[PDB]
Design a protein around this ligand. Structure first.
Ligand SMILES: COc1ccc2c(n1)CCN(C(=O)CCCC(=O)O)[C@H]2C(=O)Nc1cc(F)c2c(c1)CCC2(C)C
Length: 217
């Protein structure tokens, strides 16, 4: 794999991300000042857990679909066998959503984008799982401190998906090749942008999978 192929891969992954990100960074930052009022927060708190689940499950399910589309546009992903495509998405898609979420999170006031405005974690009180929700907020908070660029997110989330250690894979070696090239791309790009320093601050790969255990519970 030459320098030309590696930079092509970087640009390609970043393009796919751009086309499948759902919420434009520009929009999210501008909307940071648009914050749910205390009356609105109360309105969300009064809703049933069933309604809040319906709303959240709809928005996240949609977010999952954008991640599937991202995967489809990654060089080599569609060339993998049926079984491996599904195994990877099943294991990684929700982890990618979680990472993508840090973009929609404002660390100055500890709020997240939801249904047109920014609200804190108390917005989700009717769900009755303050632990899971605080941990999601903590995770987005610790990722926000890194100032993840759009392209770092693209490359990093490509690696969250293209993991050759997912159990159930048939063509393990073809997934390794793809992972290897994406790692070269990620590392090359951190080099060129002087952002090597973030490597040692990214959350461990089993730490993403430990928040999705209790998600599925
Ligand atoms: C992957 O990154 C993100 C981040 C936020 C949103 C999305 N993606 C999907 C679009 N969206 C909307 O609210 C779109 C509604 C458009 C409409 O009005 O119909 C957002 C949302 O879903 N935010 C959001 C959704 C959540 F389910 C949660 C949080 C937050 C925290 C806690 C919890 C995990 C419960």
């Amino acid at each position: 794999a030459s320098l030309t192929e590696i930079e092509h891969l970087v640009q390609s992954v970043c393009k796919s991300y751009r086309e499948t990100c759902q919420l434009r960074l520009e929009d999210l930052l501008r909307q940071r000042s648009n914050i749910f009022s205390r009356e609105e927060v109360t309105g969300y708190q009064r809703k049933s857990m069933w309604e809040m689940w319906e709303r959240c499950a709809h928005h996240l399910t949609e977010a999952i679909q954008y991640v599937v589309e991202f995967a489809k546009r990654l060089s080599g992903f569609m060339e993998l066998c049926q079984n491996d495509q599904i195994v990877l998405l099943k294991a990684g898609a929700m982890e990618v959503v979680l990472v993508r979420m840090c973009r929609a999170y404002n660390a100055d006031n500890r709020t997240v984008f939801f249904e047109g405005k920014y609200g804190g974690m108390e917005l989700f009180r009717a769900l009755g799982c303050s632990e899971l929700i605080s941990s999601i907020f903590d995770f987005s908070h610790s990722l926000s401190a890194l100032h993840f660029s759009e392209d770092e997110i693209a490359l990093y989330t490509a690696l969250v998906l293209i993991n050759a250690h997912r159990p159930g894979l048939q063509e393990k070696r073809k997934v390794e090749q793809l992972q290897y090239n994406l790692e070269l791309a990620f590392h090359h790009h951190l080099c060129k942008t002087h952002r090597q320093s973030i490597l040692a601050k990214l959350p461990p790969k089993g730490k993403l999978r430990s928040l999705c255990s209790q998600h599925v519970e």
